[PDB]
Amino acid sequence: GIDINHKHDRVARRTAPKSENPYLRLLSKLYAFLARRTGEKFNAIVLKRLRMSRRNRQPLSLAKLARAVQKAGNENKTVVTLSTVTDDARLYTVPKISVAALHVTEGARARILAAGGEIITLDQLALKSPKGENTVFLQGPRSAREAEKHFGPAPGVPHSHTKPYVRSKGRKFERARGRRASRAYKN
Amino acid sequence: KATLPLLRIIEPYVAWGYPNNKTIHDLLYKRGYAKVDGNRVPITDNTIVEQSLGKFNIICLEDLAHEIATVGPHFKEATNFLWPFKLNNPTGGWTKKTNHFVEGGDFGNREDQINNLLRKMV
Amino acid sequence: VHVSGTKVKVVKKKLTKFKRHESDRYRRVAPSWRKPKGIDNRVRRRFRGMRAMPTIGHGSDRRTRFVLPNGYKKVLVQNVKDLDMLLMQSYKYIGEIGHGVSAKSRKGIVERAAQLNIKLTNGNARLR
Amino acid sequence: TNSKGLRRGTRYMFARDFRKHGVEHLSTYYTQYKRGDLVDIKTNGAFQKGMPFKAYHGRTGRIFNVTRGAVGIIVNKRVRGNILPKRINIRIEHIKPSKCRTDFLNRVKSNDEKRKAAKSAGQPVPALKRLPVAPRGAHTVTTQNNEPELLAPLRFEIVA
Amino acid sequence: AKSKNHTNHNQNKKAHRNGITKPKKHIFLSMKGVDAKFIKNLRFSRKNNKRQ
Amino acid sequence: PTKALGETLNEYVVVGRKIPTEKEPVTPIWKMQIFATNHVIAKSRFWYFVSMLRRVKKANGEILSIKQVFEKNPGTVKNYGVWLKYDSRTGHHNMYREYRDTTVAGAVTQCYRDMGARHRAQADRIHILKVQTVKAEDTKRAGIKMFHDAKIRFPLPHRVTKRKNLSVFTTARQNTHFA
RNA sequence: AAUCAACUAGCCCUGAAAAUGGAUGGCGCUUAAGCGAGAGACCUAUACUCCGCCGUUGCGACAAGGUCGUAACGAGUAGGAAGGUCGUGGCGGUUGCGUUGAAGGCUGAGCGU
RNA sequence: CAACGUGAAUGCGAGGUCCAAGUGGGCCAUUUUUGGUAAGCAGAACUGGCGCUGUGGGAUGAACCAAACGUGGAGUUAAGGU
RNA sequence: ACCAUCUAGUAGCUGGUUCCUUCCGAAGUUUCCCUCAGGAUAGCUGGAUCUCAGGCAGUUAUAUUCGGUAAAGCUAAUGAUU
RNA sequence: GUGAAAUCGCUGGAGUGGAACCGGAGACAGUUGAUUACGCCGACGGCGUUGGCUGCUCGUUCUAGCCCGACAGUGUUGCGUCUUGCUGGCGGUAGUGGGUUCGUGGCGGCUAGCGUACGUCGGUGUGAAAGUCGACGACGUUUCCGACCCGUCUUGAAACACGGAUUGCGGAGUGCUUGUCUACUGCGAGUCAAAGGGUGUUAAAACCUUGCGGCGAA
């Protein structure tokens, strides 16, 4: 007998994408090879984000892409993101962007190409910068989800701003007792 | 003073003493294993020692033995580089294992008699 | 025996079957193994003198697992075309004609196997 | 079960020391407290206002607020498997500066001064680590005027 | 059928099962519960300090 | 508890002293004669007795020297007197016993065995106050005195002899008398 | 030529009576095979050391939903997960067998923990 | 902003979020301890166990002593014994 | 009363709850409830993982502190008492 | 049609002292395999690894005794501050010289399990068949060790707690509405489109079709 604890012996991890998409699996294969051989944490990050679940890859905004590219020194670097690149109607001027991504929406692609930009795939990025040179790694906001709005301390505890699960919205839906001092108390 | 209290706390469960030259050399040569990336690797060559302790000028089993015996400036690294020794049961048996050494038993500080015990255990 | 094409001995950790507890006492209890779930089940609690339970530790060697006592591995063939997959590694695989193959086709299968130098486990069967 | 009043079981905890009752000396109020300082809590029964709870008596905390005549303190409290940093507003009379932190600050000051002096004078960097007391070294003992005394166990005597 | 039976037998073991979690180190940075007048003055001071 | 393990307990001389302090820069040196199985037990019992006698314990003291004492002439027989204090199940008593041996350590071992045999007293309940060599005419125990006779003679009346490396059964007759 | 008195504590004895025939476990054991102090040797675990195999975990190599290497590890009720070329009945497809004998049924040679 | 650079021992990778099961009759032991004449009784404190657990020993035993378990082999032992 | 239907009436209660291996692995405790054979709640547990690559520890050392139990005292206050 | 299990009768073999069944390990009966080199088995050597038992020989630590000198004593021979013995410390140690302690010592002897730096060799197998050899030996028999009846509630079950005489077949976390989280897929500030309409004859499908509607964007 040996006095050790086995509760945390096994670590849950994704050794390959849960997706059955053949192209996603091929990309995971390619970047597993690249990470293993080049030994670059950039390739490791790309592999991990390829194998991640779609929940962890929130959509990215063309406004964020433009902001990243406009910063001093980033004008010529290639922006790499495993998140879908969406179009931002609030963005009026779009600079020249060189982006490698899994998926780019129609409007964002049209605007990027019209502005003189370039869109490539992850394998093309592998051919361009096998070690990730001259890259700007970006992703969408992970905590910006309606589901995440409901996470945290329970709505009925002090100093809690968690969103409750309510059938509807109105004066008749969980707004009387425990929400205002005129009814018992307020938290 | 920072280690003796621990020995007093664990008195009933350990037998300890003052190792000598032969004891240290036998332990390092017959049952020497290194912790290399979390793996128990037998020390069958001086290169194994040099790879990990070469930074501190320990390059051979003799250097490691000297460090341990004289409690050199790198005793911590030298010893933590060694996997805990996994000894055999003594040939001849124990005595009581439930009473102190001075009670005719086994646990506690047996001083230099640990060498006699290890001559059987190792 | 040694695995064909190799020199590793085939070792069987156990030879007896893991019979279901009380299957000898009751006829309604089939001998096929079932893991005991009872709270007081002595076999489950592993009392001394009780039948052992299946465990992964009993697993046979990876190199010798699935190897017949003659040293080959069985491959099931249903027609003459099925003899091709046995052609390359004929030194480690042995063909077995499917139970459903009639005597009319077994004849051609046996002749073709003999021509190709592929061993059969049941070549001399179903002769009319 | 026990009653759950505020001062249950504090008969001796909140009492004054023998021959120590009466007027409170004024160094208690003259002492300077600043946010970030460590202070020990020892309730003074003579001041029923701003009293700490019995569970914080004898505990050390860190000041985070300084009011006219009180201070806000963050004190660690054990609740099941978590240690909560509770915030309590205690008056000055129940508070005393903690000496452990000031001793550590003095040690750090001395370390920096020694390092600076050695560097300026060109000496090697001196050792600035506390070390556990090492085993006694080798020495010699003389018996001159100190001849050994032979000791033996004494016989049993009936002491009525 | 008495059924009060209070005890504290296994509670320390349960608490230590996952380790006793000490408080974080950023708790001393927040200015929650600090004097309103001091906070007001601090806000005014921070609003006016010239960056360069 | 303490046990007198090992045939023929060894004898050690142990010298120690309280660790000097500022108020007591020079400390008295204490010396004892202790019979124990080995030197670790010797030191333990030394500190036991010294803590009993003087305000000092192992933590505040040190062992200047531990040495073994060997019988000067194990080729001669002596009478040994042993003054001891021991505790029964009811009270505490002082005993004076006498033994005949070629070694003081052997005499003390005999004393431990004899106390175990006759009073069911274990080694932890016995303190050996003193051990000395007594002259023939200063002895006062009949068992020892009856052997101070130059004309001593006696046979071996009923000798039961044990066969060692033979079969259990035999046709030989067994003889217990040897004239 | 030792004697007398009062104590003391080891073993033994008295104090010590229950109902089916019965319990140091039994037989038995008396310079013990009992009581106390000890010594050599010896016996024996799923414990310790080493050796093989199975699998888990961590790490790693290899152009692969795979193979391999390597170190440590392997208790389990309630309960939770994973793998199942474990098994059953359909559907859309695919691969084949069958009056020279399918399903079903009885039962030897093997395979798989 | 300028300088200074890790300031006790030993061991070791650390932290975060979400979803959810079963449980919410306990019992035993060293020590402490309340009610009771006591109880294999009732009620508490610390720790370890059984419950959930097999294995060697105590002739037998949920808790005692030793020691925790893949499947095999050689050697050596623990408690206990010859 | 009997017959059919509402009606597969409800049950905090009793009984049963059907393949194999692998890994992890408890609780009988807190608070509220016409609550005490039951629930909700926190605790204990599993899974999914994600962010990173030195700050932690059911252990010690140093420094500083808290306590009024054992012991001690009543030829010291209170209460007994020769 | 097929024709299972429980249950039952016959023939032959074998066991059979107040249960019977069962796990581990052999043996027997039985079943089955068998192409100089090679397969299936054994023996003796070598080597690797883990050992078990047992001796000598050097030294090391702490220490003598024998031997010599004075003194003190006496369990004392032979014939009295006698002598011979003997003892005690004390002082010497030249020579001689054993105990105790172990060594990062030196040299041996016997022998075990596992694997194969590998050798020396025997059994058997190359048409049947018989024999021989090898492996199993499974619900047959016999031995040695272990071995209480399952499921369930329970702190606790082999229980003098409940259900269970035997066998076959059937037999129990489902459907749907509504939420939430998680995994995957498409598109993405959008997305899905309803009823409906148009078309479609392998026409309940598929395909086309929305100023407006749901959710989201405050």
UniProtKB/Swiss-Prot annotation, chain A:
Keyword Transferase: no
Region (Disordered) location: 146-187
Chief place of localization: cytoplasm
Pfam families in alphabetical order: Ribosomal_L18 (PF17135)
Compartments, record wording: Cytoplasm
Family of the protein in this entry: Belongs to the eukaryotic ribosomal protein eL18 family.
Gene Ontology biological-process annotations: translation
Protein name per UniProt: Large ribosomal subunit protein eL18
Keywords annotated in UniProt: Cytoplasm, Ribonucleoprotein, Ribosomal protein
Recorded GO MF terms: RNA binding; structural constituent of ribosome
SUPFAM superfamilies: Ribosomal proteins L15p and L18e
Domain of life: Eukaryota
Gene Ontology cellular-component terms listed: cytosolic large ribosomal subunit
Listed Basic residues bias regions: 160-170, 177-187
Swiss-Prot record, chain B:
Molecular function GO labels: RNA binding; structural constituent of ribosome
Coiled-coil zones: none
Keyword annotations of the record: Ribonucleoprotein, Ribosomal protein, RNA-binding
GO annotation (BP), single: maturation of LSU-rRNA from tricistronic rRNA transcript (SSU-rRNA, 5.8S rRNA, LSU-rRNA)
Keyword Ribonucleoprotein (UniProt): yes
Domain of life of the source: Eukaryota
Family the entry assigns: Belongs to the universal ribosomal protein uL30 family.
Designated name of the protein: Large ribosomal subunit protein uL30
Protein species of origin: Caenorhabditis elegans
UniProt gene name: rpl-7
Curated annotation (Swiss-Prot), chain D:
Single GO cellular component term: cytosolic large ribosomal subunit
Alphabetical keyword list: Ribonucleoprotein, Ribosomal protein
Record's keyword annotation contains Ribosomal protein: yes
GO BP: any one term: translation
GO molecular function: structural constituent of ribosome
Domain of life: Eukaryota
Keyword match NADP: no
Alphabetical list of PANTHER family matching this protein: 60S RIBOSOMAL PROTEIN L21
The family this protein is said to belong to: Belongs to the eukaryotic ribosomal protein eL21 family.
Identification of the protein by name: Large ribosomal subunit protein eL21
Lineage: Eukaryota, Metazoa, Ecdysozoa, Nematoda, Chromadorea
From Swiss-Prot, chain F:
TM region positions: none
Keywords, comma-separated and alphabetical: Ribonucleoprotein, Ribosomal protein
GO biological process assignments: cytoplasmic translation
Organism for this UniProt entry: Caenorhabditis elegans
GO cellular component: cytosolic large ribosomal subunit
One Pfam short name: Ribosomal_L18A
Protein name per UniProt: Large ribosomal subunit protein eL20
Domain of life of the native organism: Eukaryota
Signal sequence residues: none
One GO MF term attached to the UniProt entry: structural constituent of ribosome
Similarity comment text for this entry: Belongs to the eukaryotic ribosomal protein eL20 family.
